[PDB]
Amino acid sequence: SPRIVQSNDLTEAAYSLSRDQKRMLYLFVDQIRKSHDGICEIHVAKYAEIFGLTSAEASKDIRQALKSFAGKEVVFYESFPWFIKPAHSPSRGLYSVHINPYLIPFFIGLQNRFTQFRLSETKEITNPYAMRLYESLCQYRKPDGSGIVSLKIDWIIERYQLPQSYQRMPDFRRRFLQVCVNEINSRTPMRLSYIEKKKGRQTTHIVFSFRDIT
DNA sequence: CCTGTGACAAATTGCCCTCAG
DNA sequence: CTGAGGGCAATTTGTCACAGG
Ligand SMILES: [Mg+2]
Numbered sequence: 001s002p003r004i005v006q007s008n009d010l011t012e013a014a015y016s017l018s019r020d021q022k023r024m025l026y027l028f029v030d031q032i033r034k035s036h037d038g039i040c041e042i043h044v045a046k047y048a049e050i051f052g053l054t055s056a057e058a059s060k061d062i063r064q065a066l067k068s069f070a071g072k073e074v075v076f077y078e079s080f081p082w083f084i085k086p087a088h089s090p091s092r093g094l095y096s097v098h099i100n101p102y103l104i105p106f107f108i109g110l111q112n113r114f115t116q117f118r119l120s121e122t123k124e125i126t127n128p129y130a131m132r133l134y135e136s137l138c139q140y141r142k143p144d145g146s147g148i149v150s151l152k153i154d155w156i157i158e159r160y161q162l163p164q165s166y167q168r169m170p171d172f173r174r175r176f177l178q179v180c181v182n183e184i185n186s187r188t189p190m191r192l193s194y195i196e197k198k199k200g201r202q203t204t205h206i207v208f209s210f211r212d213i214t
Numbered sequence: 215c216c217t218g219t220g221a222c223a224a225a226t227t228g229c230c231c232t233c234a235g
Numbered sequence: 236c237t238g239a240g241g242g243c244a245a246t247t248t249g250t251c252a253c254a255g256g
Contacts, residue, residue, distance in 0.1 A: 019226090019227095044237080044239095045238090054229085054238095056237080056240090057228075058238085059237090059238050059239055059240085060238095063239075063240090092238065127248085163248080163250085165250050168250095168251090169217080170219090173217090175248060175249065179247085201216060202216075203216095
């Protein structure tokens with residue numbers, strides 16, 4: 001699929017979006033790059049095509065995901081509103097959106113540091129936290145297509161804005177870690193495992209090690 | 215403290231059914 | 236045929252109360 005290239009800033013940005021909302025942002029960056037005012041646009045047939053949905057169901061996703069963008073902010077470690085104006089359909093099947101102009105810079109490398117991947121790697125993932133992990137792991141991918149990275153549990157909870165109940169490690173393992181690891185080792189070209197780093201009686205970081213299936 | 219696990223309810227998800235250009 | 240709406244049941248995800256170390 002098209003190859004996405006977002007800055008690590010966003011990749012590490014703290015926010016809470018849905019699958020459909022994230023799928024939507026991918027396309028927003030893409031189209032933006034190969035294009036700023038932020039005034040992007042989305043088509044239902046294309047969307048329905050890329051992600052394999054019926055024209056109808058793709059309409060549900062875009063329409064609901066566009067409302068759920070109201071009031072949501074992005075915190076680049078400076079908080080920013082995703083949109084500055086309500087989305088709107090000028091033509092049947094087409095939606096026009098005004099991404100906060102002030103956000104293009106971040107959505108664009110602006111420097112050597114950045115993250116990239118193809119839509120095929122992340123189009124089969126369902127859990128938005130898993131989409132988050134994958135992208136982060138891709139921030140450490142080497143030309144080989146593998147890597148190893150240690151992440152602070154703290155950082156993960158704060159950036160991925162995980163549910164409060166995942167502050168209790170036994171629940172973070174079950175609902176977040178195990179879940180996202182499997183999802184990736186099944187819906188993406190990545191094959192990964194992990195080791196828990198400890199500080200006596202408590203897990204502090206998570207050591208992720210991954211290698212490309214191909 | 216810190217773990218793992220069973221219940222439970224709110225969310226999601228892929229389908230299904232209509233209807234107006 | 237599209238795509239804008241209205242629903243639905245089966246999973247999932249987010250909480251929490253317990254036993255044990
Ligand atoms: Mg959907």
